[PDB]
Design a protein around this nucleic acid. Structure first.
Ligand SMILES: Nc1ncnc2c1ncn2[C@@H]1O[C@H](COP(=O)(O)OP(=O)(O)O)[C@@H](O)[C@H]1O
Ligand SMILES: [Mg+2]
Length: 436
DNA sequence: TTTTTTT
């Protein structure tokens, strides 16, 4: 049931012994439905992983961290304390030893250390140290034009720069030992549903600011946020918070405040949600952690149904189901430099305990990455500031008419890091081999 | 500056 373009990639991946493939293209191009066809072909032989919970859900797999039991921190290069093989008689060891294919969805969101940790974990567990991924055939799928992987400041950023030169999956050293065969998908849903939108976005992918004039002519209407069924996106947290606060205060009903418990050193700028979180029944929220039992994910939108002491009920938009939310603990990690060997090392210095809930009438563009919305309004505020931020904001909706802007987009807000441009020009040949 | 993954 694949299109001709999808069948081309399906056959190029399944009917060759080559062990490393990348299937890439813009959103709506068929990557996920091709993944399902690959799963049906391989079924027992393949393990499906993704870097986020919502992507793992859409890929019918698990997160990379959960499968390999990686810690939620910087994965230092082949470091035995961050990358631990499974025990001698564990189910995970059997799963890795018998694995033939690893399917990795949304690979553009896989940070370089995550991918490298996969490589090392597979090599060590399978005892094939000289073969990339321990001889497992890796099928990467994803768009290469997204928000960059998260890289905190301080010694962590310096480590990643020193070790890999950057955060992207194509900067991993494993590509120096195996060639990545590339297969592009061009035909998108959007090309059929709104070709004008698809043409504008293609030019913006190419960094062409010319496209902004038509986009601004079509989409600028400052009152677009006042319309029903409209989620508001902002570049920064402060403006989204003010939006949410206004909606919360206008919502009739009795409020309940959830007070975080903070221990040790945890600056409030690093808080994953508000320390004093006030909620009302019916408030639009977004969940902030992945359920270990798979009933909800970080990024799930929903509505507050019940509010009680350290426990609330949320009705999920995704499936209409009810989930009960209790506090989670986040850790603050600091990396200290040893200054005599290379030797940075993590230490947990603080903890933050709070219900994993944030108000969601307004969201940041970063937080809305990976959601598909029916209608969005972009309240630009002081402006977009990150690689891919404009493109990700625009692509949250299916049609240009579903989008509105508070003001014209400026050419300074169309941002792409040159390393991503360089990698794209090299994967237009059909195969890519990282130098060194 | 500026925001976000991962348990
Ligand atoms: N071969 C196909 N047959 C039927 N529907 C398809 C096919 N390919 C894509 N679609 C539809 O197009 C939409 C986008 O496809 P998807 O696999 O989600 O693309 P992407 O992974 O790039 O977002 C999906 O909702 C899917 O229903
Ligand atoms: Mg996809």
């Amino acid at each position: 049931g694949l299109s001709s373009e999808q069948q081309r990639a399906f056959l190029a991946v399944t009917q060759t012994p080559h062990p490393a493939h990348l299937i890439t293209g813009p959103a709506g191009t068929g990557k996920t439905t091709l993944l399902y066809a690959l799963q049906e072909f391989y079924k027992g032989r393949a393990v499906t992983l993704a870097p986020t919970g919502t992507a793992a859900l859409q890929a019918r797999g698990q997160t990379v961290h959960s499968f390999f039991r990686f810690p939620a921190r910087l994965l230092r290069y082949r470091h035995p304390e961050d990358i631990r093989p499974p025990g001698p008689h564990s189910p995970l060891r059997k799963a890795i030893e018998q694995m033939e294919v690893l399917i990795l969805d949304e690979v553009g969101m896989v940070r370089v250390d995550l991918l490298e940790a996969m490589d090392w974990a597979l090599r060590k567990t399978r005892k094939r140290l000289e073969e990339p991924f321990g001889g497992v055939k890796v099928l990467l799928l994803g768009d290469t034009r997204q928000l960059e992987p998260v890289v905190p400041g301080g010694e962590e950023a310096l480590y990643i720069a020193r070790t890999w030169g950057g955060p992207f999956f194509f900067q991993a050293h494993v590509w120096e030992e195996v060639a990545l065969r590339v297969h592009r998908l061009w035909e998108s849903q959007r090309q059929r549903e709104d070709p004008l939108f698809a043409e504008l976005l293609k030019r913006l992918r190419q960094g062409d600011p010319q496209a902004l004039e038509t986009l601004n002519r079509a989409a600028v209407r400052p009152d677009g946020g006042e319309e029903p069924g409209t989620l508001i996106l902002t570049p920064r947290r402060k403006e989204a918070d003010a939006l949410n606060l206004k909606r919360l205060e206008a919502l009739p009903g009795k409020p309940l405040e959830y007070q975080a418990q903070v221990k040790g050193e945890f600056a409030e700028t690093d808080f994953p949600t508000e320390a004093a979180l006030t909620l009302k029944k019916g408030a639009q929220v977004i969940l902030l952690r992945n359920d270990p039992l798979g009933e909800y994910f970080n990024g799930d939108l929903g509505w507050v149904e019940d509010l009680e002491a350290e426990a609330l009920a949320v009705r999920l938009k995704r499936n209409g189901r009810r989930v009960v939310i209790r506090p989670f603990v986040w850790e603050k990690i600091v990396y200290t430099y040893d200054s005599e060997r290379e030797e940075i090392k993590p230490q947990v210095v603080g903890t933050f305990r709070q219900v994993p809930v944030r108000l969601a009438w307004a969201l940041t563009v970063h937080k809305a990455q990976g959601l598909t919305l029916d209608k969005v309004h972009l309240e630009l505020g002081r402006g977009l500031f990150a690689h891919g931020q404009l493109y990700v904001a625009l692509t949250r909706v299916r049609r240009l008419q579903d989008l509105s802007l508070s003001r014209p987009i400026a050419p300074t807000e169309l941002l792409w890091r040159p390393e991503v441009e360089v990698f794209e020009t090299r994967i237009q040949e059909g195969i890519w081999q990282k130098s060194h």
